[PDB]
Enzyme design. Structure first.
Site, mmCIF file in Angstrom:
data_model
loop_
_atom_site.group_PDB
_atom_site.id
_atom_site.type_symbol
_atom_site.label_atom_id
_atom_site.label_comp_id
_atom_site.label_asym_id
_atom_site.label_seq_id
_atom_site.Cartn_x
_atom_site.Cartn_y
_atom_site.Cartn_z
ATOM 1 N N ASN A 162 -7.774 2.401 9.334
ATOM 2 C CA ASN A 162 -6.515 2.420 10.066
ATOM 3 C C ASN A 162 -6.836 2.349 11.553
ATOM 4 O O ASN A 162 -7.542 3.215 12.080
ATOM 5 C CB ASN A 162 -5.711 3.679 9.742
ATOM 6 C CG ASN A 162 -5.380 3.802 8.264
ATOM 7 O OD1 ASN A 162 -5.778 2.968 7.452
ATOM 8 N ND2 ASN A 162 -4.649 4.854 7.909
ATOM 9 N N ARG A 177 0.842 -1.184 0.000
ATOM 10 C CA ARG A 177 0.000 0.000 0.000
ATOM 11 C C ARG A 177 0.882 1.241 0.000
ATOM 12 O O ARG A 177 1.794 1.363 0.823
ATOM 13 C CB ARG A 177 -0.942 0.011 1.204
ATOM 14 C CG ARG A 177 -1.859 1.219 1.224
ATOM 15 C CD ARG A 177 -2.777 1.234 2.430
ATOM 16 N NE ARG A 177 -3.372 2.553 2.598
ATOM 17 C CZ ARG A 177 -3.025 3.412 3.546
ATOM 18 N NH1 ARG A 177 -2.144 3.091 4.480
ATOM 19 N NH2 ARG A 177 -3.564 4.629 3.547
ATOM 20 N N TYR A 179 -5.125 1.679 15.397
ATOM 21 C CA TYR A 179 -3.918 1.599 16.210
ATOM 22 C C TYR A 179 -4.192 1.264 17.664
ATOM 23 O O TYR A 179 -3.446 0.484 18.260
ATOM 24 C CB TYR A 179 -3.134 2.920 16.137
ATOM 25 C CG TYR A 179 -2.432 3.137 14.816
ATOM 26 C CD1 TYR A 179 -3.094 3.720 13.740
ATOM 27 C CD2 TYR A 179 -1.109 2.747 14.640
ATOM 28 C CE1 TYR A 179 -2.453 3.914 12.527
ATOM 29 C CE2 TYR A 179 -0.461 2.939 13.433
ATOM 30 C CZ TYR A 179 -1.137 3.522 12.381
ATOM 31 O OH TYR A 179 -0.494 3.713 11.182
ATOM 32 N N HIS A 184 -3.022 11.169 0.363
ATOM 33 C CA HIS A 184 -2.505 10.923 1.701
ATOM 34 C C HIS A 184 -1.974 12.218 2.299
ATOM 35 O O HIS A 184 -0.799 12.299 2.674
ATOM 36 C CB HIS A 184 -1.420 9.845 1.663
ATOM 37 C CG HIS A 184 -1.252 9.109 2.955
ATOM 38 N ND1 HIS A 184 -1.334 7.736 3.043
ATOM 39 C CD2 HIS A 184 -0.986 9.551 4.207
ATOM 40 C CE1 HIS A 184 -1.138 7.364 4.295
ATOM 41 N NE2 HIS A 184 -0.922 8.446 5.022
ATOM 42 N N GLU A 241 -7.435 8.622 6.052
ATOM 43 C CA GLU A 241 -7.691 9.262 7.340
ATOM 44 C C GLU A 241 -8.177 10.698 7.184
ATOM 45 O O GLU A 241 -7.433 11.636 7.502
ATOM 46 C CB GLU A 241 -6.432 9.231 8.212
ATOM 47 C CG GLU A 241 -5.860 7.841 8.453
ATOM 48 C CD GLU A 241 -4.781 7.833 9.523
ATOM 49 O OE1 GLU A 241 -4.354 8.927 9.939
ATOM 50 O OE2 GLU A 241 -4.359 6.739 9.950
ATOM 51 N N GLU A 290 -3.777 0.169 7.998
ATOM 52 C CA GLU A 290 -2.646 0.576 8.819
ATOM 53 C C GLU A 290 -2.790 -0.023 10.208
ATOM 54 O O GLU A 290 -3.863 0.048 10.812
ATOM 55 C CB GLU A 290 -2.545 2.103 8.903
ATOM 56 C CG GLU A 290 -1.698 2.731 7.808
ATOM 57 C CD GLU A 290 -1.640 4.242 7.906
ATOM 58 O OE1 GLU A 290 -1.609 4.764 9.041
ATOM 59 O OE2 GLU A 290 -1.628 4.910 6.848
#
Length: 455
Positions: A300, A74, A302, A118, A163, A357
């Site tokens: 994404n 990616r 985390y 991005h 994002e 991510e």
């Protein structure tokens, strides 16, 4: 069978964070290069002028990716590298670069996954108002249209915006990301509306000029975690996870603010009530344009946070135990976020799901043996994949996982003080060193996750 046989194992990067060559081969300026020119904004006044010099060293990085047996990559396209002024004149050396990068990927049996935007918005369009300008929907459409015409015949996966919570929230509402401003709710919601419209226009034109390319989007948010597995507690976390927040909070960090218009065809009911005095012009053609059918949904993820309620129904956020597992960012290590996140998203949106991510920052060093030992990354990744496997074993339509990042790179406000990659990068010599997590991740791909330590 921890994961399915078709599961996709990948790594992820982004253009401004690795490419470098910010002022070379006709690349135009973007908002982050401009943001970095303000003293004291980035850690030690770092910038992305050089970064990892991936623009010049892409073949080595592809050879390193083949060495770890990575089947999917990616990455993001620098809008300003193809359109130096956002629109109009095409920069051929930037077009040639992504051709050379994509060809090197295909030549080595690596499937490209392309992120169109991005965060590196061309500075010329930012000086025209950015996403505040209603023309930004067209700027991004023409950008998407050219990319689909030029590369659609050899790119099977394209995601529009990485994002948007950061681009809109940190960029325009909280002043934390580029351009670093804190604008009014009208500006923020108008900017949110034009980004969503730009997404839909990009999807619709890509169905015409790149019809064999699967399309998606990868937002992000903290994952609301239930305090237990009781249906009553799971509903509190699900409600918070898709809630629309008050205007006095960081209200852009909402999952439903972006994905309900995209997948369900309209903003949530709470959006029209809470933001009534700051609403932008919303036509039904807007919502129809935004709500194009997608082929996959990504996220994404985390970390996550425990959430509950008190007697009055207000949200309660319990403390984390003293000494809790954390990363070099100070972020908590919460592997259950890779279960509840994909579970909540799949149940609400019912699209094939990718994790685009996941990873952590580690204070990695090249030790005396000239190797980079990061067992904390191995433990972090192993624990997160276990909870992600639980979601796959429970029947959710999970398709893959992209570990951020492939290599240490420019971590925005933190500069190069935070290392997220499975490959170490000395930013002076540009010497690459595969970390222990890289060779461990190679075995995970070869075993399709059957080597993951349990408990």
């Amino acid at each position: 069978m921890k994961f399915n046989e078709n599961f996709v194992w990948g790594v992820a990067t982004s253009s401004y964070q690795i490419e470098g060559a910010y002022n070379e081969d006709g690349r135009g300026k973007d908002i982050w290069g401009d943001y970095c020119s303000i003293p004291g904004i980035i850690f030690d006044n770092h910038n992305g002028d050089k970064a990892c010099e991936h623009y010049y060293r892409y073949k080595e990085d592809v050879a390193i990716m083949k060495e770890m047996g990575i089947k999917a990559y990616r990455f993001s396209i620098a809008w300003a590298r193809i359109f130096p002024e956002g629109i109009g004149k095409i920069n051929q050396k930037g077009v040639d670069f992504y051709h050379n990068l994509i060809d090197e990927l295909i030549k080595n049996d690596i499937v490209p996954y392309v992120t169109l935007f991005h965060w590196d918005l061309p500075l010329e369009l930012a000086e025209k108002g950015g996403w505040l300008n209603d023309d930004s929907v067209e700027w991004f459409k023409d950008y998407a249209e050219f990319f689909g015409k030029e590369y659609g015949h050899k790119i099977k996966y394209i995601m529009t915006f990485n994002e948007p919570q950061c681009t809109i929230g940190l960029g325009l509402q909280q002043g934390i990301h580029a351009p670093g401003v804190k604008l009014s709710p009208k500006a923020v919601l108008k900017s949110t509306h034009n980004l969503l419209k730009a997404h839909g226009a990009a999807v619709k034109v890509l169905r015409k000029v790149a019809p064999n390319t699967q399309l998606g989007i990868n937002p992000t948010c903290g994952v609301a975690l239930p305090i237990s597995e009781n249906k009553k507690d799971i509903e509190i976390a699900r409600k918070r996870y898709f809630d629309i927040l008050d205007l006095n909070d960081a209200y852009v960090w909402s999952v439903s603010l972006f994905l309900d218009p995209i997948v369900l065809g309209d903003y949530p009911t709470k959006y029209y009530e809470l933001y009534k005095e700051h609403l932008p012009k919303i036509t039904q053609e807007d919502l129809k344009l935004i709500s194009q059918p997608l082929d996959f949904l990504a996220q994404n993820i985390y970390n996550g946070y425990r959430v509950s309620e008190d007697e009055n129904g207000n949200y309660v956020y319990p403390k984390r135990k003293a000494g809790y597992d954390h990363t070099d960012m100070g972020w908590p290590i919460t592997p259950s976020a890779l279960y509840w996140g994909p579970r909540f998203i799949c149940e609400r949106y019912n699209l094939p799901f990718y994790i685009t991510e996941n990873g952590l920052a580690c204070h990695d060093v090249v030790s005396l043996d000239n190797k980079v030992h990061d067992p904390n990354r191995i433990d972090f990744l192993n624990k997160y994949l276990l909870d992600y496997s639980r979601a796959s074993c429970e029947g959710y339509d999970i398709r893959g996982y992209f570990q951020w990042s492939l290599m240490d790179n420019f971590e925005w406000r933190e500069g190069y003080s935070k290392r997220f990659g499975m490959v170490y990068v000395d930013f002076e010599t540009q010497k690459r060193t595969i970390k222990d997590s890289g060779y461990w991740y190679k075995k995970v791909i070869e075993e399709n996750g059957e080597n993951l330590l349990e408990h």
